[model samples]
Target chain A: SITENTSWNKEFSAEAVNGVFVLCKSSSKSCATNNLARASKEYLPASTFKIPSAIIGLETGVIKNEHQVFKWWERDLSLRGAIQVSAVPVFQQIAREVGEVRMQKYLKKFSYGNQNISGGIDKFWLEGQLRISAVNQVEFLESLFLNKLSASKENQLIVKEALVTEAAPEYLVHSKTGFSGVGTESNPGVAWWVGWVEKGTEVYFFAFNMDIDNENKLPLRKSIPTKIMASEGIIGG
Target chain B: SITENTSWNKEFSAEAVNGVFVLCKSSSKSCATNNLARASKEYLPASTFKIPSAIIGLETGVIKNEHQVFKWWERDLSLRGAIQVSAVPVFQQIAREVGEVRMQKYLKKFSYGNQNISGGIDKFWLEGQLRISAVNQVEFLESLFLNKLSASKENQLIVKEALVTEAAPEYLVHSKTGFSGVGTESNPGVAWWVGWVEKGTEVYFFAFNMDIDNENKLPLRKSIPTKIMASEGIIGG
Candidate 1:
């Protein structure tokens, strides 16, 4: 079940922010969203698309594994390393190698975004029409966390492992951050922080995206959601 | 202060096991070992040498970064990948490329395992005179954890990330396991599990080794120590 939790809005309001935050817990099969309306509205996924792109690379064998090196300038980068640096050219190479047909097939199978690769294969998720809502991002992350996607279980696990930003004995936090360019009044840019938390038997998945007024506010994409999650006792304050 | 806390001996005895366990806490600068005598004894590091070997490769620019690919028989393995699978051939190449002069240099600098590479450049840690005690392993690990090793901080951090087996928001567990094969009466086979656990601001470094009477007891290298760690509430049961 999904419900709007209005109290979370202050986290955004306190910072004079405007965004939506969605968090879903596995144990309860429930989700709480700060702004249900915007949570369902689609926006360019930006670098967040790298998650699926990397998985498709592994499944399609364009990239062999997390450690598979892709040529970058004079150097080479593993999928894991490229992800850390957000090396867009390397991933664009991954997408190009994955090709349009296979990429389209996997995205549709994943029920991802608009399933649009009409934009150039490498550029679609970035400058093209591919759009996924915050709610959809959470859903997709939940599937990835549960290893329920159409992709291979091994790949899901690898991507999950690659996303781990924090790890301790009792809990793990796996996440990614994304940002679209600053935009005009008609089409505000978007910034995103999405991932999941594993503590004991409970898994909490979250997706947060906000209207990016400027580069300086980009940090809010993560801080606001972290504050909200802390409010809910999902993470440390 | 390193003190013998014999209470941990029960963890080994409960399973009819013969081994030594050493745990050092960063906050207290204190250590509790089940068998002080045995903990001070040295044995073959086995694959545990990969940690230092990997660091040496990076610092010496033989393999570059964690993502740098090493040549395998027919495939390519990155330093990060080689470590995950404990690929011997790949690391042997790394050791061979690191060569005797630099290997001895870093080893002596790290004060690692008698600073011996006398057997052969590539074979010393595996089959040569190179040996390290459980206490020494913990000491080396603590230096690595604090980035206090003679190596560059960048290389140390890279190796640290490569060693993470478990990660959580509150803590991270970075470790490696080793085995020196079954030996004769004069040299019984030795098995080892060494690594550290990070919980909040506190870190627990551990090294455990046992006399392997038969091949079946290899799992105790990890299980026994995990049992001991759980007993200390350093990790979950």
Candidate 2:
């Protein structure tokens, strides 16, 4: 009767974090639609916006390709390196090149939450008007994996290949981790890990977000996905 | 440090029944090998013993093929149908045909449980000597899915196809349910639902066992797998 997998939610809480963990198929059925409060509620996409930023960057010829390097201060990092280390300054620079008008257009095309970039082009996805629910995040990931977005297959593939955190014969797990705390370390606003697993050609999308009143549980960000995916039997390794 | 997942195990305990659930990949890793008490302890295979009995029967020509209709009381059922109904008498009869010596050899070859069929041929798996731990059951199912057993490919395929419980475009679930302890109604004998799911060419095997004090929880034998598998995001529907 409880379609909620409260045990998972309890596990999340026991780890000393208040959050939502969701695993869903491309078909829209959720494994953890149980947490209505956190799952349905919206949050800033934070650095996860880099996924789209990279896409728009490539499409708009601002970054050209994954090998294209962006300069931040005295350092220049390839798009891959920028995304890998989550060099926010590089992406914020790319967003500047992609510009506010183009960013708004692509956000509408992707149907990104609120489709709003009003908080300022560079800071919109982080502490801004652009927001997305965990539910919407899964849908967007699925759409990306399916190549249903307005972006070209090549650009989507480039972005996906760039997002690859793990790759093996059985499956590949691609993901990005995001957090938007800034000066409020004690409050720890919101943290996110979102991505999809590709088994052969089929994709399983997941979105995980948590509320952090304390800063230390931030480590639980990585642990949550590893716990949820492994326990869900998605990433056995 | 344990790779096995106790998340599902924790959920199982929260239910009315104190039970153990094991999910094993054919690659030799168990998702929940940490729970030794319920998993390593031996329990009567009950109807699950039918899986082996039917396999040996077909391999030895005792049952001929899945199409072989065995006479049970006044009615008759095909090998596949008998397995579906878990008719104790039919498998008992097949065990009689395969006899003790051949059954003993196959059991030894498979390293099934204690490998002791000292109890009578028809009743050994039910109440007598032939007992297997939940751990061993997972290993056996993994071997069966991989076609690593001593049985020929044809016979293995025949039994597997016969055991098919659900089939879809993406995956197929093949399972068998078992129970023991006919006399101890209040004590709740061991009940099981064990088998593998084939996704493309990969197979994921699972074993679920519970002490059923009441018959109502008995339905969990099937409901457990459906919920566990779907929630794991392995079986979408």
Candidate 3:
């Protein structure tokens, strides 16, 4: 059995690693409990939520095209302008237009974070509470690659178009980034990036997290992940 | 010619925009100054800093190898491990090792954040006060990608190994993730992710942030990025 690997031979006690379990299936199949895994279900989606927002916009016809321009807060109004600039006001406006009820429904359907938490009267205000495991994250991406979510061809195309248009070209990747100040007296917060890469016939989905005490005095942008990307040759102009 | 563009738009209040610029490079690059481009320098990077830490580790010999497993503390231990788990103790340890002197050197060499900030014990303690722009962030990544920082081929390999190993797959990607409490009160401060991706011959780098006002009520793990990754075709297992 899997327990056979639990050896007591070393200085440290051997135990199963902690992380979410992922069961990849080309068809319908299930794995034994022994193969089950656990992951950090405490992660917040952050700006990564934008992927879904874009999806909703496409599905609802709120956004006609990725290249189609939106007046940039009465300044530089363009879809490119909005995303490239990380214009919150623009996105918020779009979110409002899509309507809270519909967005909430989609969020629930996606199983984002802790759905039990209430945003009070401002349902849109507290939608950030959704948490997910890395394993589940990959599963979601796989479904997208397989065209599992969109209800209509037009909706799917909109999502695909927005993803392609907005993604940074280094990987033909589609992604949304987010940061939040989790409730804490000091540095209580979360930061996130969720996206996909399609290389040749292979497609990979990724999520990264960093949780820290506020007193440590480190900024999110200067974190270890940034350095890692730079070293790995993934960082470029 | 540059002056002409700057002056041409000065009279047009409708088109006039508030903008700020700080030069990190010796080269001359024109930046747009308009309301559409106006953004605060106070924005924080969340897990994105992980990319830089990974790169520094690779440049140095601190992290021997990506797959070379190190025992994790049940709680938090060294800086490296802390970084791995987003633990405070480990981050503090690594910061001490890097020290104010060495850290300042790297910060300057890479032109990270604001140069107006001083370095040393005072600077080290006040790291949170520093700020970085998205443009500079990309520049920093560019340097690391080119190995502008002095690092051995072996060390570089180690860093690359760790990055790829940690990353979900081998699409030429590397990154870091982070979360923290927001203000002096220790409420949701900021969450962030920064990193780069390489697919085929292309490469790109990015950083994201989120701000919060509460902790127990608003944890970083429950943010939007996690949700997007979970249900969308983005970051996953």
Off-target runs (Cα >4 Å) in candidate 2 are A1-237, B1-4, B182-187
TM-score of every candidate: 0.56, 0.48, 0.38
lDDT of 2 by residue, B82-136 (tens): 7767577888888888999999999988889998887798888886877788778
Query: Tens digits of per-residue lDDT for model 3 on A68-123?
Result: 45764265444433543556666777777787677777667756555332342122
Query: Where does model 1 exceed 4 Å of error?
Result: A73-75, B1-173, B176-237
True lDDT of residue B202, candidate 2: 49
The model with the greatest DockQ is 1
Candidate 1 residues A1-237, lDDT tens each?
A: 679998998898898888898888872258888898998899999999999998899899887754466666366554555665668898889899999999999999888988888789989988998999988888888888767889876577677766777754445678998888889768888989999986544579999999886898888888898888887787775
Docking class of 3: incorrect
Rank all candidate structures by their TM-score, best first, as comma-separated numbers: 1, 2, 3
Question: Considering every candidate listed, which one attains the maximal lDDT?
Answer: 1
For each prediction in turn, the share of the native Cα contacts (below 8 Å between chains A and B) that it retains comes to: 0.19, 0.00, 0.00
Q: Please compute DockQ, using alpha carbons, for every candidate against the native two-chain complex.
A: 0.10, 0.01, 0.01
TM-score of 2: 0.48
